Design a protein around this ligand. Sequence first.
Ligand SMILES: [K+]
Ligand SMILES: [K+]
Ligand SMILES: [K+]
Ligand SMILES: [K+]
Ligand SMILES: [K+]
Ligand SMILES: [K+]
Ligand SMILES: [K+]
Ligand SMILES: [K+]
Ligand SMILES: [K+]
Ligand SMILES: [Mg+2]
Ligand SMILES: [Mg+2]
Ligand SMILES: [Mg+2]
Ligand SMILES: [Mg+2]
Ligand SMILES: [Mg+2]
Ligand SMILES: [Mg+2]
Ligand SMILES: [Mg+2]
Ligand SMILES: [Mg+2]
Ligand SMILES: [Mg+2]
Ligand SMILES: [Mg+2]
Ligand SMILES: [Mg+2]
Ligand SMILES: [Mg+2]
Ligand SMILES: [Mg+2]
Ligand SMILES: [Mg+2]
Ligand SMILES: [Mg+2]
Ligand SMILES: [Mg+2]
Ligand SMILES: [Mg+2]
Ligand SMILES: [Mg+2]
Ligand SMILES: [Mg+2]
Ligand SMILES: [Mg+2]
Ligand SMILES: [Mg+2]
Ligand SMILES: [Mg+2]
Ligand SMILES: [Mg+2]
Ligand SMILES: [Mg+2]
Ligand SMILES: [Mg+2]
Ligand SMILES: [Mg+2]
Ligand SMILES: [Mg+2]
Ligand SMILES: [Mg+2]
Ligand SMILES: [Mg+2]
Ligand SMILES: [Mg+2]
Ligand SMILES: [Mg+2]
Ligand SMILES: [Mg+2]
Ligand SMILES: [Mg+2]
Ligand SMILES: [Mg+2]
Ligand SMILES: [Mg+2]
Ligand SMILES: [Mg+2]
Ligand SMILES: [Mg+2]
Ligand SMILES: [Mg+2]
Ligand SMILES: [Mg+2]
Ligand SMILES: [Mg+2]
Ligand SMILES: [Zn+2]
Lengths: 49, 143, 155, 102, 53, 110, 118
Amino acid sequence: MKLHELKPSEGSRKTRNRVGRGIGSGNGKTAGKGHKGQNARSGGGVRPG
Amino acid sequence: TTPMANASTIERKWLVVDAAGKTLGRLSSEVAAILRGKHKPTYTPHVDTGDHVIIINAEKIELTGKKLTDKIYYRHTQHPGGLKSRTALEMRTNYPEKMLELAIKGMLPKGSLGRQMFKKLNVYRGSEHPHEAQKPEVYELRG
Amino acid sequence: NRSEVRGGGRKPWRQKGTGRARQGSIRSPQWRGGGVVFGPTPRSYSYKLPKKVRRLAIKSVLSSKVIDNNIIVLEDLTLDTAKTKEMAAILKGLSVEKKALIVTADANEAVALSARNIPGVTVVEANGINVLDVVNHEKLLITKAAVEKVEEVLA
Amino acid sequence: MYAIIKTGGKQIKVEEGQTVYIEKLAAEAGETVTFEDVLFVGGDNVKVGNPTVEGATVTAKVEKQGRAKKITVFRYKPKKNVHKKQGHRQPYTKVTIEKINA
Amino acid sequence: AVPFRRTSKMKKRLRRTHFKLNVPGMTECPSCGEMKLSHRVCKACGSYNGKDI
Amino acid sequence: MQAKAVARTVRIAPRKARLVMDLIRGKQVGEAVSILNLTPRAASPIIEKVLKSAIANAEHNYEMDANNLVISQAFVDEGPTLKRFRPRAMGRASQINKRTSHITIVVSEK
Amino acid sequence: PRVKGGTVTRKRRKKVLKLAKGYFGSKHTLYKVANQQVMKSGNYAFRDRRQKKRDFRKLWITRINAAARMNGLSYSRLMHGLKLSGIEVNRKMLADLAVNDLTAFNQLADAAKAQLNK
RNA sequence: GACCGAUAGUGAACCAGUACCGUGAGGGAAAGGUGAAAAGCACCCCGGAAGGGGAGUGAAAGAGAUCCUGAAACCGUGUGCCUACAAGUAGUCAGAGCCCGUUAACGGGUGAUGGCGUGCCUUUUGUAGAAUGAACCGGCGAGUUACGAUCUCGUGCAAGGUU
RNA sequence: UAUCCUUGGGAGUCAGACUGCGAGUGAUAAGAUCCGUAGUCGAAAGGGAAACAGCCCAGACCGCCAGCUAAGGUCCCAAAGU
RNA sequence: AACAGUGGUAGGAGAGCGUUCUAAGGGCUGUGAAGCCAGACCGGAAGGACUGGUGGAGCGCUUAGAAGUGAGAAUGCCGGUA
Ligand SMILES: [K+]
Ligand SMILES: [K+]
Ligand SMILES: [K+]
Ligand SMILES: [K+]
Ligand SMILES: [K+]
Ligand SMILES: [K+]
Ligand SMILES: [K+]
Ligand SMILES: [K+]
Ligand SMILES: [K+]
Ligand SMILES: [Mg+2]
Ligand SMILES: [Mg+2]
Ligand SMILES: [Mg+2]
Ligand SMILES: [Mg+2]
Ligand SMILES: [Mg+2]
Ligand SMILES: [Mg+2]
Ligand SMILES: [Mg+2]
Ligand SMILES: [Mg+2]
Ligand SMILES: [Mg+2]
Ligand SMILES: [Mg+2]
Ligand SMILES: [Mg+2]
Ligand SMILES: [Mg+2]
Ligand SMILES: [Mg+2]
Ligand SMILES: [Mg+2]
Ligand SMILES: [Mg+2]
Ligand SMILES: [Mg+2]
Ligand SMILES: [Mg+2]
Ligand SMILES: [Mg+2]
Ligand SMILES: [Mg+2]
Ligand SMILES: [Mg+2]
Ligand SMILES: [Mg+2]
Ligand SMILES: [Mg+2]
Ligand SMILES: [Mg+2]
Ligand SMILES: [Mg+2]
Ligand SMILES: [Mg+2]
Ligand SMILES: [Mg+2]
Ligand SMILES: [Mg+2]
Ligand SMILES: [Mg+2]
Ligand SMILES: [Mg+2]
Ligand SMILES: [Mg+2]
Ligand SMILES: [Mg+2]
Ligand SMILES: [Mg+2]
Ligand SMILES: [Mg+2]
Ligand SMILES: [Mg+2]
Ligand SMILES: [Mg+2]
Ligand SMILES: [Mg+2]
Ligand SMILES: [Mg+2]
Ligand SMILES: [Mg+2]
Ligand SMILES: [Mg+2]
Ligand SMILES: [Mg+2]
Ligand SMILES: [Zn+2]
């Protein structure tokens, strides 16, 4: 192998999803959280169970 | 490729229409079309391709039904309670040229070009007109 | 972050009535000179592959050097005087133009000193061989003693 | 003399020597194309097709295979975060009309 | 009462059509030849109506 | 040939200088000096000195006849603003822009 | 590592402003309003590429109707007669003849009249 | 140092816990860049000066002192096209006329006139909305990291795997 | 005709609206309210109903200065029958 | 090739663009780097070149890696200017 021609195994690495980076991505604005309520808030949602 | 008439290309005839015994609206609709140039195959929407129209015997225009008594020409002076009215009989007797002009103006396009198209209309009460110099042809309404 | 920035204790102005946007601290992140939201924090990037994967990696790159014909096995590498001119002459003698990893069995002082100043020439013991050094240097110059010492561990 | 021919799902009035842009034909620059469907021939000997003029052809030399000036198709819906940008360059064949064979 | 909308550059410029100085009501002094205001003493030479003031 | 003069960062508001400049732009330099002399405005003496400086540059540097000169360009650009504050009622301050002007005249031979 | 805002923002906004050249006042000058107008222009251009096909057909029909009536036919009857005769010359071409070669148009109108008078 | 690079990085790259604010505890800024070298513009000219035009220095002075670069808003000067009968979310499509001539393209600028057309965002059953937000421009400004859990995918080994 | 089921990963939603039809509440009032049922809007641009989320017609990958139709229209504004 | 499909909010899934830094390889640059300004060029989009001007010393490209990675709205913060 060469350091200038490195290649990962196919399906070993994916690009991370970055929310709140514009409408084209499909996670713009509300960042996949929908509208309002406890689940859309920072630190939101109820405890497990 | 579709040709477009322009100020250079356009050539306007002068037409005389006799209003005597003609129904106001039926005459008006045909004249409005001639002023717009709808009868010309060089008709172009954004320029005035139409012909000049002289109307004579405007006082002899006819109205069906009881429209002489019952058709009312309203206008408002933009002052409070400033709605004025004249009957069609009053219009035909005293303001026959305005009556035809009002009918035709309402049938022309609205906007700058429509206002320009109206300038080629010339309406006269009696039989005579002063446009001998323009050499006007008689135009019979198709109807 | 907003906690670690100097000052910023008080509410800049009252909640209501001023006509300004409500603000809680002069060091809130939207403020110039305010705290950073997230951003870098000290952390390690290290992780360990399974030992068998580590062995397969080193054997893979060593076996790759044999395929490419970038393996120069030496009978011995004994520089008498620790002199860079001599090491440079030996590398010219072996047609080693570009980078090279020299691999001795034990810690050879004279070889290590002589090669130290030549760009792109690293010296390691047999135990100090590693994937990145092997892959980064074109030629691999191993002594016979070192090959035996590598084969002791890996095989 | 002129002819009305059908090509590219459209009709074009052509004279001899005229350069015309039409929808992309499967041909190369230099090649001779023939237009079979001639709906009408004008000038002196007027021929009216039904639908086509029987035996009439128009031949033409292919000047260029190109793509037209770019259209940026941009569409959005107010208040719904729906934007859609799409470039378009429509292929054409530029032909010079050689001979109307009425 | 406050501006409901800001005034455009155009409208500001249209308003300033008449906000303009006039050229002084000036004539050549018959004594010294400098320009003076008509019906005023010439500041340069101090003359008015062919008389030193 | 052209001769230029500039008065940079003169303490007069650009709008006020431009009123007077509009009177002299295009004019023959003799006529311009007369207009400025008889225009009762704060900008007049300032603009006069720039005009006379440009005329002197034309004579001395470029060897141009002063009687044949015309104002070919004349304009006021904005200089840097001196920011001040006026105490208003109720303990409020309101900004005062003490504006400056760069005043350019270019004279050329007719 | 820190990524500064850098040049990407200026480059993107400037392209929008160049698309807004010729727009009135602040619409060619300020990014926010230029952006809105370029977006609106997209919606309008898409709509009007469709309306263009309607407007030209409307224009050709008007011209064919005028020429037809010079030959003593309405547009309605002319097109019926052309359809019965199997003439497939489209409205663009018929309107082209109506303006450019009216004698050729009249032959097609005569062909239509022949079918109608059957 | 796969840390920052002057709105960042310390509050503080600079005479900063200063200036300034507060009776006090206390709060707490802004502000980096001439040039390789001062060679920091002798001298002449307008001006009281400021400032400028030459001249000289310099590779460069449109590097001449908050003096590298020098965006945008914003303010001006000049003028190619249009504009004083017009009803305008300002564009878009159609389109003469006039003026140009390119990354040479079924080109560029302008736009008489015609058709169509109630900004953007947020929030809503529904907003051109007479609901909300933004004066404008620029910069900065929001799902991160650690350690656990789980699933998918990948790789090694496999009834073993792993420290 | 090409859906359906199971298991596992990830959601969002829990203010609905009008229209037709079947009911309640109301006064067999409400652009009212509350259910059932179908549609459209929501999340759907295009044509028609002057304008007009919810009606009528119809689902916009993109280009064309081709053609045929839908609702609705064909004296003039305004395309097509005085 | 043929056949079929391609409106879309919340939202799921995929493929990409660009930014800073690092590694390796290979380059550019005082015969003018980045930045900036202009243009009638190119790509399905994000975007990318080319030419000229300014600028006066740095910077691409390829493959992989890592993120302070993309702004038009927060009565956002700071500055400038209306
Ligand atoms: K989600
Ligand atoms: K600070
Ligand atoms: K201008
Ligand atoms: K228009
Ligand atoms: K309110
Ligand atoms: K119902
Ligand atoms: K450059
Ligand atoms: K972030
Ligand atoms: K803001
Ligand atoms: Mg979505
Ligand atoms: Mg948004
Ligand atoms: Mg929200
Ligand atoms: Mg809710
Ligand atoms: Mg929710
Ligand atoms: Mg604190
Ligand atoms: Mg900080
Ligand atoms: Mg007081
Ligand atoms: Mg950095
Ligand atoms: Mg930014
Ligand atoms: Mg159609
Ligand atoms: Mg800086
Ligand atoms: Mg700081
Ligand atoms: Mg004190
Ligand atoms: Mg410079
Ligand atoms: Mg330098
Ligand atoms: Mg500078
Ligand atoms: Mg006028
Ligand atoms: Mg009038
Ligand atoms: Mg409500
Ligand atoms: Mg309003
Ligand atoms: Mg609210
Ligand atoms: Mg507001
Ligand atoms: Mg802003
Ligand atoms: Mg319900
Ligand atoms: Mg209800
Ligand atoms: Mg049921
Ligand atoms: Mg909703
Ligand atoms: Mg649906
Ligand atoms: Mg509709
Ligand atoms: Mg409508
Ligand atoms: Mg809506
Ligand atoms: Mg039909
Ligand atoms: Mg009609
Ligand atoms: Mg879809
Ligand atoms: Mg579809
Ligand atoms: Mg997703
Ligand atoms: Mg950089
Ligand atoms: Mg360049
Ligand atoms: Mg960021
Ligand atoms: Zn005197």
